[PDB]
Curated annotation (Swiss-Prot):
Gene source species: Mycobacterium tuberculosis (strain CDC 1551 / Oshkosh)
Region (Disordered): 143-163
Protein name in the entry: Ribosome-recycling factor
Subcellular location: Cytoplasm
Pfam families: RRF
MF terms in GO: ribosomal large subunit binding
Gene name linked to the record: frr
Domain of life: Bacteria
Amino acid sequence: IDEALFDAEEKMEKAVAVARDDLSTIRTGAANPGMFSRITIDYYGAATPITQLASINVPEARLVVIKPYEANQLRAIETAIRNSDLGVNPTNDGALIRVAVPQLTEERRRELVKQAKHKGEEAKVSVRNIRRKAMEELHRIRKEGEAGEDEVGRAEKDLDKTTHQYVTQIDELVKHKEGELLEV
């Protein structure tokens, strides 16, 4: 009963932390080595972040250097960057992947803001799914006679109260991000 809630709560903060990380890849200014922290390729049957397959170094404020450990992996790596939501286009000199963020742009801003809201809604779907699963377990508890109806009643309210707390955290994260990309 309490266990169902603790667990749900635990699963929900993890969802919030995914939102947080996801949102942090949305540039608002200049480069970052974690702008690419979410980018993966198929590496011998496994979804592998490109940060495991390349040194990720920032020389300028605007430039990142991606240096594949395996020259043969460069193109796959490069292709994953281009297919990403980063809306940037990398180059290469055969051994090193250079990527300069565009000067921003007001058209670009609007897209970023839109990306921000979307990533929040994805994170909300996940949080809501966690609620549903936990609610199913409270419905079972009640059916099997494992706790009294009042107790299960209170837990359903607590579950929804908690869910709302994490959805709201997500709203604040999205809120901060749009702020940042309108001023910053």
